[PDB]
Amino acid sequence: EPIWEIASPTITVFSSKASNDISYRVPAIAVTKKGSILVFCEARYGTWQDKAGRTDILMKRSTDKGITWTEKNLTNQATSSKLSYMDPTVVVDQVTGKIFLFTSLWDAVGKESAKQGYNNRAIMYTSEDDGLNWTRKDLTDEVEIGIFSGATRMIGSFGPGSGVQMTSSEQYKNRLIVPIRTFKVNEAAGTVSNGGNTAMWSDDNGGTWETGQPNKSGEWMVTEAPDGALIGNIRYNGHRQNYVSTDGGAKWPSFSDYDPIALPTPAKGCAGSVIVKDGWMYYCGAKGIIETTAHDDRGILYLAKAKFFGGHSHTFDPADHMVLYDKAAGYTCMALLPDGDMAIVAELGNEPGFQKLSTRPAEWMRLELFILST
Template sequence: MHTTRLLAAVRFISIMRLTGGRRLCVWSVFVLTLSALVGSLLKCDHVRAEESPADTITVFELSEDPQQPFGYRIPSLVVTQAGTLLAFCERRDGLHDHAENDIVLRRSSDGGTTWEPMQIIAEEAGDSLNDPCAVVLKTGRILLRYTRFPKGIHARKTPHTEIAEPGYDGPRNVRVFLMHSDDDGRNWSAPRDVTREMRRREAISLGSPGVGLQLTRGEHAGRIVLPNYEVYHIGNNERANDNSVSYSDDGGETWSLTPPIEDDGPVASGDEAQLAELPDGGLIMTSRIFPEINGRLVSFSHDGGERWTKHRKATGLLTPACMSSILRYSWPGYESGSILLHTLPRTQDSRSNGTLMISRDEGESWQSVKVIVPGDFAYSCLARLPNGDIGCLYETDDYHKISFQRLNPELFLQE
């Protein structure tokens, strides 16, 4: 629950934590000040937090105009070769997943302090455009992938949508598109249909929001890799997921699709996923878990993403079902060692308590560095800024805002 709304509504509250349906503890807290409330909330999560810094900036915000009630969700953040920040997301007619979504963009040329007016870079009448996934190439070209759902069709049946069908050419088929910019994100190409290259015929949809990457090391240096989660309809409203990777060795002109990543056991499979590069040119993938249970799955590739270890539960990544971000900050030999960063909502069962995590053993284990957003914190995307700071673009305020925050690397370089 958002702290401001809590203070406005109550002075005496009960805070309850739940895990696996069991009540662990109940604290009754008499709230005297804002700092007391924040401190009490975070004791329940066993993580110390500080108030959000003053330089947190709102990049997208829910419109209060009844004629254009647009909401904004699903952030993607990249830094171009020129040092420009590009913040993508879905603009929705409301907030639900299938809301005639458009893909929109704002640019910042000063490290995220100010942002240019919003651009609509992809729209398709009543169709819904979902899951923006961007990657910056060493040539300076920026690629953006998204998934297009026909009007009234989605990857699951809801009161206002029917479930999609497998195949490529039918009216209920979901398509995957790729577009590019060669001028630092100012102008964009027409979308190119890459459905047959990226999605299996038997799958009803494919996507994964956030970012891809271009490998810089090993025999596959230069390869572009994009994370995937594919959805399959298995009867009634039941569905199954798996993870895979789409990769290109020719600058994004043609694409190959890896086999699905195997799951280590029948309990869960991968959902929305993100990637980071390993020192040998391999990859680590962390994935949201489907069905929705706590934690994240992790898998490794040592051949440029073509083959993967079986998914297993990641060590130290406590989080509810939610898209999360992973970022390579430094390599072995760096003065503070090899560092991977992860942001996620660090609680048992709510998208809140946004926390920066660190791994110094190439993703084998993770430790908490700092709570960066004590309140609402859902989907997020990390990027290394030109000055060495970390930029985090994230959903907050009950999905009413997508905000940007700069993080000083001294948070994790002190050790």
């Protein structure tokens, strides 16, 4: 039985300034072949609100488990831009060591909720030199989504968080799996609606990308079980949903909701994280607290673990829950370190939840790195 511990004092990778200056949201983490940690996040200028103005995708890279860092701005939007990069989603090719990061480019400022996502573009950033340099590629028009029950679909967004490479699967060996979320297009109204989630995958180290059949919708991440089954976890209000594909991401017919006691979450939901190590599955996210007028319901970072036992069956024991932080806790992502450690990045704050103010002070949220050891 693995028993984890915060092996050091936690590191603060990103710290938000005043909401009206710049805020850092939605962290994604990846460990490169060499052993370098890459932490990606959304840089929201002038506001904290979703899809409310200009945004960049930022990355901080550390070669020494977070002691020293370098920062890069991958997107570099002109200050004039009114577009919003969102939902950084990353996967690493453990063959080539090539790193892929996916982000959705919205044109949503001012538009109504149903038309905010209409113009979304699916953007991919790849790096072949351990994160030092990145190539940009717009997949919006190369990557087609099937017509299902007559419906027109588009890529809505990704993850957020991390995908997975299928290393335990012989049938789909080394397939790169990226969690996507589709939109159903209404061409006569100019609106979009949720089309369900599926996988976007590549069997040729990212040269070509193919999609599967969507089903359930919601922010989600995906990992691979010891038996090659893809195990996803979807955000819902008050519960997490299991989301399993046994055919390499093409279809997602198996799903069930976790009891709140096994995997608790805020009443209004929050993005969580999943990963697998040595036949154990881990979920990490906010436990959820009672929201008040001052702060939301996103509090208490925790990590849960379950042992696979029937191929990819598993049961999260609440007795195996490990609390990591008692105050505000939000979006999370996880990665595996070469030395056997586990890297966890998370949104944290100092109030029991995150603050609700129109303008929120510096350090109202930070992206904190955890290093856990067995």
